[PDB]
Amino acid sequence: DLADRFAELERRYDARLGVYVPATGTTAAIEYRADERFAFCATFKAPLVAAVLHQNPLTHLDKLITYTSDDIRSISPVAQQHVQTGMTIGQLCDAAIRYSDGTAANLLLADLGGPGGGTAAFTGYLRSLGDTVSRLDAEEPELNRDPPGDERDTTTPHAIALVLQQLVLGNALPPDKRALLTDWMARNTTGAKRIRAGFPADWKVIDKTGTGDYGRANDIAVVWSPTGVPYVVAVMSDRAGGGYDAEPREALLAEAATCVAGVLALEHHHH
């Protein structure tokens, strides 16, 4: 029946929807198109920050990066305001996650893999985590613009949720670094109408959104019940039928999340 509900969302929104919630010790996996490829869009920025955190001491967060107006080739709310004074690596991580800053992402990719080597190094971080499916091939803003079906710049709901699980809920990061990642996601500003909108206010939600051409709208989150039980939620979507300038529809993601939350929150007392 949950598959029937997701199918109805696809019809109503003229969209392709992918959902993955990993199984837990007391909940079955929720899977819809979970092995189909979808463009990451900005969702890669959460693992990207992880990779930078992992490979460096915390003192690397204080390193000041200078850039110019010519580096700003993508929507960059925070980099545009510090272009004259520069941004530390920590500031860039913050911006990349909380404001989906494109320049910040590109600077972090340069810090991880050097000029021209960022996308391969980022992909390499995913492979170190055991993700053999995802791939990043372009920087911002070109990574949001590949046609439908191109495998460049893609993940799957399945792969990205498992990555996030390891980052947030597993041992991929030591606790101090983990807490920075988790806090930046917790205080994201771009996700109010997506997975957050699907969960009750007393569940903690941390997230990272993505939006792109062909009506692409994604969101990846970790949520905790009111008693601290964690679940990962990946929701991916596109609307290729509208062409490259198709309207993304956030509400599809809110609705998919509401379907999930309903399952995760509803209890089944034995009478």
Side-chain angles (χ1 to χ4, degrees):
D1 271 293
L2 206 51
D4 294 324
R5 283 261 284 146
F6 293 144
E8 186 278 343
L9 301 190
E10 285 192 311
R11 298 191 302 273
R12 174 149 47 71
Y13 282 98
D14 174 50
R16 184 180 56 123
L17 172 71
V19 180
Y20 190 68
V21 178
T24 75
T26 64
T27 67
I30 302 169
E31 296 169 300
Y32 188 85
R33 301 192 191 287
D35 289 310
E36 299 191 19
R37 287 184 178 278
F38 295 78
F40 268 115
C41 304
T43 63
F44 83 99
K45 297 171 193 182
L48 172 65
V49 164
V52 173
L53 284 170
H54 186 63
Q55 193 171 295
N56 296 281
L58 285 177
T59 49
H60 187 239
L61 297 178
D62 304 307
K63 179 182 192 198
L64 182 65
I65 310 302
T66 53
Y67 58 99
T68 75
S69 294
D70 281 347
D71 294 298
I72 306 173
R73 302 183 15 80
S74 65
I75 300 172
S76 299
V78 179
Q80 287 275 40
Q81 100 194 3
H82 292 97
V83 64
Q84 303 184 349
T85 55
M87 293 177 63
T88 65
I89 293 281
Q91 295 175 137
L92 292 168
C93 290
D94 186 317
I97 292 176
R98 297 191 36 250
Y99 291 91
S100 209
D101 190 292
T103 301
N106 285 353
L107 300 166
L108 291 169
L109 280 168
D111 190 65
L112 188 69
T119 61
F122 167 73
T123 303
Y125 178 64
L126 302 188
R127 299 290 180 273
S128 82
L129 298 177
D131 173 7
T132 62
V133 172
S134 314
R135 56 186 290 168
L136 190 66
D137 296 266
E139 297 190 18
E140 296 280 7
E142 288 88 10
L143 63 85
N144 307 292
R145 302 184 181 173
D146 298 295
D150 194 326
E151 297 183 30
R152 287 177 302 165
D153 305 310
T154 65
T155 189
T156 64
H158 190 196
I160 194 57
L162 295 173
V163 160
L164 192 63
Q165 186 171 62
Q166 291 181 251
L167 293 179
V168 174
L169 299 178
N171 200 43
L173 291 172
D176 53 5
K177 290 182 191 183
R178 190 186 314 147
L180 294 172
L181 178 63
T182 297
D183 170 79
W184 283 317
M185 298 182 69
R187 300 186 294 101
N188 177 33
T189 74
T190 68
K193 301 290 207 306
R194 299 181 185 200
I195 291 167
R196 180 62 274 182
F199 276 80
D202 61 357
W203 289 53
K204 178 183 183 170
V205 178
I206 73 172
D207 85 298
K208 179 66 201 81
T209 57
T211 308
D213 284 359
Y214 303 92
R216 286 163 174 147
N218 307 318
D219 199 15
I220 64 174
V222 184
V223 306
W224 291 253
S225 85
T227 61
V229 178
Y231 300 89
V232 184
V233 184
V235 187
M236 315 195 70
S237 74
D238 48 31
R239 292 202 56 262
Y244 87 86
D245 237 33
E247 296 281 352
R249 296 290 185 209
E250 305 197 275
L252 168 57
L253 297 187
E255 292 185 42
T258 298
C259 289
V260 166
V263 171
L264 296 178
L266 280 293
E267 295 172 7
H268 306 107
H269 178 56
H270 173 324
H271 296 65

